[PDB]
Structure 1
Amino acid sequence: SGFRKMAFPSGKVEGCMVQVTCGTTTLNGLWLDDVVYCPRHVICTSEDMLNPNYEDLLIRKSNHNFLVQAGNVQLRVIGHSMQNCVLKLKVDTANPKTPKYKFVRIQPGQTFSVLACYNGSPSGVYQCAMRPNFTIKGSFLNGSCGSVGFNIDYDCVSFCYMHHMELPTGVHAGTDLEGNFYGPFVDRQTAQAAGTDTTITVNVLAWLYAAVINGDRWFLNRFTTTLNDFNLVAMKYNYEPLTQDHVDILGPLSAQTGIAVLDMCASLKELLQNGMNGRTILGSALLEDEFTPFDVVRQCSGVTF
């Protein structure tokens, strides 16, 4: 038993991380097959970031301007191209440690593991969620750009995130591996508005189910509610509305605990209106929304890779 915010094992990704340097900018890159992916702002100076013209800047760079370094093994760039906001550095050597991988664009509310890197070297791994406003609340210092987020399913690494920038508000924004930003942000040093950050209701429900599984049931009540009535209260507390798709996804947790989704909604409703009275659930005094229903099932069944 027990419940922890658990990250995927990072071994398969550690062996894909490289240091990319262009001029005096050094950040992290993702080396898969004979290609290296990295944020395109590696080519900018500090002055450039205020208002970069990436096409103009990229034309004054040649293949030999990019220094890719994998441990003490230098790679040779024999082709470069810009795809959206990522630079694709074609190199002479295919990474022998390339895993079975794919690129996926995740939806808000989904979780993934982040391997924080500096100078192409792993530093730490943590689990986080894509917020509904398409930001993440990570831990990134300068030179972490190029760090990637990922999920593992069986033997296949799903890369879903590349870190690009920290907003003046201290939250983090990045792209998928095709270079398309999550959210309306752009890779330029300017004030950019993130939208309201709402709470991922379906994830809260999965976490409450995890609590019941681990013996925390003080919050249960025999009240019930309707999906419409619940959403009216959820909307007022900046909780994402719940849909029938969310109810379906929680079915397996409903079956294992004998507690209907709408009954659990009624217990959450009470918590929002009356608070936690200084009590806790799974060691937390706040409602947690960084566990998907799949995460809970995964951790309460014992899945390996």
Structure 2
Amino acid sequence: SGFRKMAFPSGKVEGCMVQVTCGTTTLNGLWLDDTVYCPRHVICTAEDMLNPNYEDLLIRKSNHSFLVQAGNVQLRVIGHSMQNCLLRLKVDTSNPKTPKYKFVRIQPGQTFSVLACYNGSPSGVYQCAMRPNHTIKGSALNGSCGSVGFNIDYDCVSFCYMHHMELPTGVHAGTDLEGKFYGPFVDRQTAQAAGTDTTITLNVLAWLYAAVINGDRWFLNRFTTTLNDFNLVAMKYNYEPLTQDHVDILGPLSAQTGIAVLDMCAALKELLQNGMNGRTILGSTILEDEFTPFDVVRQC
């Protein structure tokens, strides 16, 4: 493609990955300073996940009930507390590879990088968006419990995600770095359904501007639509409503190109009605919605 969906360089996070073992269960952990962050469902067995009373089970454990390991180096755990759906493990050694960090809660439609980690060891990095239905798309390895989502601003890593659950159909449900879930999910193996997932209009529009800056112009027209007219057609083709709050955000990209939001909205309208019809936008034959206006400006 002419526009690559780029993850952040995973270096500053690679050095923060460990494995957390409790009984037979083993998953990834985030080692920052003298604390290891991991999903709380680690203390549960395959049987315990059916209906887990965590406080009831966690009390049956002690510091030594936890195998934390950074590569070959073994970490002595000297305390444990529970914060929502996270396990907070206090360790005897502080992490010398700790980057300048922050904990954030991203909005649906916002993007980040996920470092998929296989039993403490990192395996790969990809870029994604928090879908409107509060889920992350994925597979067997895409989200291995404890694998984290992050943005890197200059030298500051802002952790926003942690994989916790895999839904029925390769859909991943997780938590922020406070243990608070994203959307209406819970950490227990029962029947969980995803909501009506929609296409993030704001990001698609940004991508069309990204398109324009790279010379691609064939989709642009003379017609000019109203905001209300657009939302009608948007909802028809399963697109997220465009709010007035959204058009303010496209301002910078609009200025950059001299193409008003609504005029670009009359272009998207025709693209929804008619499609590419043999043609391409930035190498793609489909309309990408995983590029936030921030990502575009940053990468252009």
- TM normalised by structure 2 equals 0.97
How far off is 1:282 after superposition? 1.2
User: 8 Å contact 1:20–1:38 — kept in the other structure?
Assistant: yes
CA distance, structure 2, for counterparts of residue 195 and residue 97 of structure 1:
39
> Is the 8 Å Cα contact of residues 146 and 163 (structure 1) preserved in structure 2?
yes
Is the contact between residue 225 and residue 263 of structure 1 (CA under 8 Å) also seen in structure 2?
yes
- Secondary structure of 1:250's match? helix
Gap regions ≥5 residues in structure 2: none
Q: Are residues 291 and 144 of structure 1, via their aligned partners in 2, closer, same or farther at CA, if it must alter by over 3 Å?
A: same
Q: Is the Cα contact below 8 Å between 2:69 and 2:75 reproduced in 1? A: yes
Please list, as runs of the form range in 1=range in 2, the aligned pairs for 1:130-279 lying within 5 A after superposition. Answer: 130-141=130-141, 144-279=144-279
Worse-matched range after superposition: 62-71 or 139-148? 139-148
Contact 1:207 1:296 in 2 (8 A): yes
> In the TM superposition, what is the alpha-carbon distance from 1:73 to its structure 2 partner?
1.0
Q: Report the count of equivalent residues.
A: 300
CA contact (8 A) 2:143 2:172 kept: no
Residue by residue over 1:204-231, the C-alpha shift from the partner in whole angstroms, topping out at 9 and shown as x without a partner, is: 0000111111121111111110111111
CA contact (8 A) 2:81 2:87 kept: yes
- 1:138, distance to aligned residue in structure 2 (A): 2.7
Q: For the Cα contact (< 8 Å) 2:138–2:170, is it kept in 1?
A: no
Partner residue of 2:30?
30
Q: Which moved more, 1:232-241 or 1:135-144?
A: 135-144
1:140: how far off? Answer: 4.0
Kept in 2, the 8 Å contact 1:28–1:143? The answer is no
State the Cα distance separating 1:46 from its structure 2 match.
0.9
Query: CA–CA distance in 1 between the matches of 2:108 and 2:286?
Result: 20
8 Å Cα contact 2:164/2:173 also seen in 1:
yes
For residue 44 of structure 1, report the CA deviation from its aligned partner.
1.0
Please state whether the residue corresponding to 1:57 is helix, strand or coil. Answer: helix
C-alpha separation in 1, matches of 2:259 and 2:170? 39
Flag the 1:124–1:142 CA change in 2: closer, same or farther, 3 A: closer
Q: Distance in 1 between the 2:178 and 2:62 partners?
A: 22
| Per-residue deviation, 1:252 | 1.0
Structure 1 residue runs of 4 or more that deviate by more than 4 Å after TM superposition: none
Deviations 1:27-74 (A, max 9, x none): 000000100000011111111111111111111111101000001111
Deviating more after overlay: 227-236 vs 271-280: 271-280
- Taking structure 1 as reference, are residues 159 and 202 closer, same or farther at Cα in structure 2, changes over 3 Å only? same
Per-residue deviation at 1:139? 3.8
**Could you tell me how far 1:101 is from its partner in structure 2?**
0.5
Partner secondary structure for residue 136 of structure 2:
coil
For the Cα contact (< 8 Å) 2:2–2:283, is it kept in 1? no
Query: 1:118–1:143: 8 Å Cα contact kept in structure 2?
Result: no
1:80-136 Cα distance to aligned partner (Å, 9 max, x none): 011000000000111011111111011100000000001211110000000000001
Equivalent pair of 1:85/1:181 in contact (CA under 8 Å): yes
TM-aligned CA deviation for residue 15 of structure 1: 0.4
Cα deviation for residue 258 of structure 1 reads 1.3
Per-residue deviation, 1:177: 0.4
Instruction: Say which is worse superposed, 105-114 or 232-241, in terms of deviation.
Output: 232-241
TM-score by length of 1: 0.96
